[PDB]
Structures are given as C-alpha cells and as structure tokens.
Design an enzyme around this catalytic site. Structure first.
Site, short mmCIF file in Angstrom:
data_model
loop_
_atom_site.label_atom_id
_atom_site.label_comp_id
_atom_site.label_asym_id
_atom_site.label_seq_id
_atom_site.Cartn_x
_atom_site.Cartn_y
_atom_site.Cartn_z
N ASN A 1 6.75 -1.86 12.14
CA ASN A 1 7.89 -1.12 12.62
C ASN A 1 8.98 -1.35 11.58
OD1 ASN A 1 6.78 -0.16 15.14
ND2 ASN A 1 7.03 -2.25 15.97
N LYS B 1 8.70 -7.76 1.12
CA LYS B 1 7.85 -6.60 1.35
C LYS B 1 7.36 -6.09 -0.02
CE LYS B 1 7.98 -2.22 3.98
NZ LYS B 1 7.38 -1.44 2.84
N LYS C 1 13.57 -2.36 5.57
CA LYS C 1 13.48 -1.54 4.38
C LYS C 1 14.82 -1.42 3.65
CE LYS C 1 9.70 1.72 3.97
NZ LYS C 1 8.58 1.57 4.97
C1 LIG Z 1 0.15 -8.74 9.49
C2 LIG Z 1 1.22 -7.66 9.64
C3 LIG Z 1 0.64 -6.53 10.50
C4 LIG Z 1 2.42 -8.25 10.40
C5 LIG Z 1 1.66 -7.17 8.23
N1 LIG Z 1 1.45 -5.86 7.86
C6 LIG Z 1 1.85 -5.44 6.59
N2 LIG Z 1 1.66 -4.10 6.20
C7 LIG Z 1 1.57 -3.13 7.33
C8 LIG Z 1 1.74 -1.72 6.78
N3 LIG Z 1 0.71 -1.47 5.74
C9 LIG Z 1 0.71 -0.12 5.27
N4 LIG Z 1 0.12 0.19 4.06
C10 LIG Z 1 0.13 1.50 3.64
C11 LIG Z 1 0.71 2.55 4.37
C12 LIG Z 1 1.28 2.16 5.58
N5 LIG Z 1 1.30 0.87 6.04
C13 LIG Z 1 0.67 -2.48 4.64
C14 LIG Z 1 0.54 -3.89 5.24
C15 LIG Z 1 2.49 -6.38 5.69
C16 LIG Z 1 2.97 -6.10 4.36
C17 LIG Z 1 3.59 -7.10 3.56
C18 LIG Z 1 4.08 -6.75 2.18
N6 LIG Z 1 4.10 -5.40 1.89
O1 LIG Z 1 4.42 -7.63 1.39
C19 LIG Z 1 3.71 -8.40 4.10
N7 LIG Z 1 4.30 -9.45 3.39
N8 LIG Z 1 3.24 -8.66 5.38
C20 LIG Z 1 2.66 -7.71 6.16
N9 LIG Z 1 2.25 -8.09 7.39
#
Ligand SMILES: CC(C)(C)c1nc(N2CCN(c3ncccn3)CC2)c2cc(C(N)=O)c(N)nc2n1
Ligand SMILES: NC(=O)c1ccc[n+]([C@@H]2O[C@H](COP(=O)(O)O)[C@@H](O)[C@H]2O)c1
Length: 312
Positions: free
Chosen positions: A85, A115, A310
C-alpha cells in the site's frame, strides 16, 4: 595433475574463491587483493579445463553464464508475493500508524528499509543449494529465471548453512552500471533504458545468460517467505538472519520504536537519497513483530502491516 589430485584441489579453490567472492560481492568488503583472487581463479579454470567433469554449480567460474533458453517457464509462488500500500505524505504515514495502533492496541516498533528501485525476485534453496529463481510476475505466478540469477554475483549458489528456505528480495542495477549500459546501447544504436528498474527488468528477460552475466545486476534481500529452520521473530531479525546465511542485505535499515522516529528516518534518507549508488523511490515501513503482522493480516492485494512511502 591427476584426476584425484584435481578433484581435491578444485573443492579447496571453490571453497576459498567463494569466500573471497562473498566478502567482495555480498559484504562489499574484500579481504584480499584482486590479483590474489585472479591467480586462484585462473588455477581453478585450468583444472576445470583439464577435467570438465569437476565443474560444479557453485564454482565461481559459472557466474559468466553460457546457457541460452528458448523461453521462460512458469514459476508459481507457493507463498504469494503481495503488493504494497502507498503513502504520499507525512499525514498518510501517521494515518497508517494510527490504524496499526487501533488494531493492535498499543504502540508498535517499525522496521524501516529503503524502497529499492528494481525487480522483486524469489529465491528457493534446498539443503543450502540454489535451486530456483523467479520473478514476482503477477504475485502468484512469475517467470523461472533461475539460470539468469546464477550470473548475479551477489546471489549465493550455496548458503553458509545447508538449510532449505524461500526468500524474496530486490534485484537492481547500480546507477553507474545503468549509465554505462545506456552509453553502450547508444553506441550500438539501440533504445536506452528509461531508468534502472527497466534496465534490471529488461536484463532479467534476456534468454542468453552470457549477456545477463554482463549486465552487472545486484541484490538486496528483504524477506523470508519460508523460514525452514530459521528462528527470527521480527523483521529486523529476519534481515540479520538473511545476512548470516549468506545473503546481501541493505545496510541502511533501521528499527524505529515510534512513528516519529520513522518520519525522521524518512527525512534522513530523503536527503541522502542522491548519495546512494542505487536508486530508491521511497521507504518501506514494516511492523517489526511477526506476531503483530499476523494479527493485522493482508487485504486482498497487500499486507495491513506495511506501507511504502513514495517520494514526490
Ligand atoms: C514483504 C512485503 C510484502 C512487505 C514487501 N513487498 C515489497 N514489494 C511489493 C511490491 N512489489 C512490486 N513489484 C513490481 C510491481 C508492483 N509491486 C515489489 C516488492 C517490498 C519492496 C522493497 C524494496 N523495493 O526495496 C522492500 N524493501 N520490501 C518489500 N517488502
Ligand atoms: N578481491 C576479491 O576478493 C575478489 C572476489 C571476486 C571478484 N574480484 C574481482 O572481480 C572481477 C570479476 O571477477 P569474476 O568474473 O571472477 O567475478 C575481477 O577483477 C576480480 O579480481 C575480487
């Protein structure tokens, strides 16, 4: 050099070269000088050339790739790879924290991570051996890019412990590699990549592993999906444990006890942003305690225990 002498020497070299490679690629802190690694590397390549049957999946000479696939196979995710979210203002963040406190009934600590701008991938290990690599895809089914991930230097082919786990992380391309890659494409009359994320994603869709090995991709592991024998009861612990078993994690992580410490963290790296060798487009805030993440559960598309702030 006989086969018996070579069979033994090869394992010693792999053992030592992989340790050096771990310090260099995973810890970003090499102990020996390159020429030390190069000689040993050249020695193993001589042995492998003499006895190609001594080549193993965890031999550092494999990072260069070689396989060319006809296409990618489907890669179902045993555990879903949820979305995140989003929050776009200080208010959105405190709004989220209030909802978390309302559901849990007390103040909660947040594990904060940058992120990373790249592609989410899942890695599967059996008895410490790398067996499968997949893209996030639509969350429940991605593409099987195991062979390409074998060329990503920071991805361990064999863990520090013979355990079986499933972890998820971000595979990105550093700013400088992104820059050089576009110049290279410009020189060849190709279309450049709009950003590092696209450069990473496009590189991982490449079917010739020889090419992907040259794209200079890197990783940051951020979660344990299938814990196996692992302990960890909090996200902060999961990150330290990912590092312990041999994964590359992001050093900029921080455990914040309040939502105010979290905002200060956001601001801190909001400035430092431009000084990192990789692009980030925000901060990922996570309820630290797993017992609490479980309580909050997930919506249909994302966890109720995490939010991605973001950048504007
Ligand atoms: C384990 C959870 C679900 C809480 C989670 N989900 C993530 N993301 C979700 C959306 N995902 C995604 N990818 C492509 C298109 C849409 N959503 C890409 C992974 C995370 C992304 C990063 C990061 N970017 O550094 C991070 N440090 N922790 C994350 N943790
Ligand atoms: N000093 C070290 O421990 C160490 C480890 C791995 C690669 N390197 C260097 O990285 C470069 C690429 O080597 P590889 O193609 O074997 O991955 C070389 O210049 C090599 O010397 C240094």
């Amino acid at each position: 050099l006989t086969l018996t002498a070579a069979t033994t020497r090869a394992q010693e070299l792999r053992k030592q070269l992989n340790q050096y490679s771990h310090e260099y690629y995973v810890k970003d802190q090499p102990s020996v000088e390159d020429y030390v690694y190069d000689r040993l590397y050249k020695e193993l390549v001589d042995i492998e050339t003499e006895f190609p049957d001594l080549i193993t999946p965890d031999s550092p000479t494999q990072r260069v790739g070689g396989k060319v696939l006809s296409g990618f196979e489907k890669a179902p995710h045993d555990i879903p790879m949820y979305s995140l979210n989003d929050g776009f203002s200080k208010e959105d963040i405190f709004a989220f924290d209030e909802r978390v406190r309302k559901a849990i009934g007390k103040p909660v600590a947040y594990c904060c991570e940058l992120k990373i701008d790249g592609l989410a991938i899942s890695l599967r290990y059996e008895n410490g051996v790398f067996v499968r690599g997949a893209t996030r895809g639509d969350g429940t089914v991605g593409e099987n890019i195991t062979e390409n991930l074998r060329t990503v230097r920071s991805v361990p082919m064999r863990l520090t412990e013979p355990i079986s786990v499933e972890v998820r992380g971000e595979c990105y391309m550093p700013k400088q590699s992104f820059v050089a890659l576009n110049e290279e494409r410009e020189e060849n009359g190709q279309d450049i990549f709009a950003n590092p994320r696209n450069a990473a994603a496009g590189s991982l869709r490449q079917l010739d592993t020889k090419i992907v090995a040259k794209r200079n991709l890197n990783t940051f592991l951020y979660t344990v999906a299938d814990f196996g024998p692992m302990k960890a009861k909090t996200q902060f612990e999961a990150l330290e444990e990912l590092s312990a078993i041999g994964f590359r994690t992001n050093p900029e992580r921080q455990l914040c006890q309040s939502i105010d410490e979290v905002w200060a963290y956001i601001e801190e790296y909001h400035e430092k942003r431009s000084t990192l060798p990789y692009e980030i487009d925000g901060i990922v805030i996570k309820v630290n305690e797993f017992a609490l993440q479980d309580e909050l559960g997930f919506t249909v598309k994302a966890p109720r225990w995490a939010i991605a702030y973001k950048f504007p």
